């Protein structure tokens, strides 16, 4: 996260770290959506242009973390994966359309002050909150600058951007399964996700029921925190029928 700040303890208790077993390293963020299901970006698990195609046994998820690098004894919980589910129409060939994946844990994780699921939006909460200018919150342990790494989880609040502005900022084809967020050059304030944040959550706190909802998944950006560029996020609500289908079936 660029131009963010240190998270408070327990501020993002749904935050998950996707961790490579060997070599031991941060791969991506992710989020806890129930005691057995973790949501992330498909490209965190499958990206053939980079020879990336992880299997379950390659990975762990670390839940309840605050420190990036520390083993947080008596606080974090480390879970093995039972099964990865990639959206069947995830477009790794072109533009990361439908950049979403689920991971089922081998065992349920125990909730605590540090570990708690985020809500997924209903149609109405999505319609109400996914509006240009409305801010969400992005969290992660990714790099602090494009060109370094945080001691603890970082947080930044960023406004959703008008779709024409998103589209006009890039040559990539933007789909309805994406939204973008970030400040404009003239807005003064700054901030973005960066390398290692992808797969983590973009959340909004509903003013109707005072619950946190995951509206986006950190998907892609051209650079980090560049003027005139914006971060792109998977539109979780648009893909929620797939999420529900996977959870209902498996």
């Amino acid at each position: 996260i660029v131009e963010g700040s240190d998270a408070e303890i327990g501020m993002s208790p749904w935050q998950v770290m996707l961790f490579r077993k060997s070599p031991q390293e941060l791969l991506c963020g992710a989020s806890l959506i129930s005691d057995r299901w973790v949501l992330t970006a498909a490209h965190c698990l499958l990206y053939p242009p980079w020879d990336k195609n992880f299997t379950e046994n390659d990975l762990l998820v670390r839940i309840g973390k605050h420190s990036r690098t520390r083993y947080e004894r008596n606080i974090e919980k480390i879970s093995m994966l039972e099964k990865i589910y990639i959206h069947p129409r995830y477009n790794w060939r072109e533009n990361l359309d439908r950049d979403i994946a689920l991971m089922k844990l081998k065992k349920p994780v125990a909730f605590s002050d540090y570990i708690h699921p985020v809500c997924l939006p209903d149609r109405e909460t999505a319609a109400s909150l996914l509006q240009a200018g409305y801010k969400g919150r992005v969290t992660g342990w990714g790099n602090l600058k494009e060109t370094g790494q945080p001691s603890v989880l970082q947080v930044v609040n960023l406004p959703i951007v008008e779709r024409p502005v998103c589209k006009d900022s890039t040559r990539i084809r933007i789909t309805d399964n994406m939204f973008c967020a970030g400040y404009k050059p003239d807005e003064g304030k700054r901030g973005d996700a960066c390398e290692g944040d992808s797969g983590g959550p973009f959340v909004m706190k509903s003013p109707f029921n005072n619950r946190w909802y995951q509206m986006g998944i950190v998907s892609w950006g051209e650079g980090c925190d560049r003027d005139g560029k914006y971060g792109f996020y998977t539109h979780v609500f648009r893909l929620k029928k797939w999420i529900q289908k996977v959870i209902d079936q498996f």
Binding site: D113, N210, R211, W212
Partner: peptide, 28 residues
Amino acid sequence: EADCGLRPLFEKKSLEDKTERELLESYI
């Protein structure tokens, strides 16, 4: 989950984090 999105150290205790108000103020 019925209890989703309510943080033990914040909403469950009626404590506000340092920047959530920034989000609320944007929901105009």
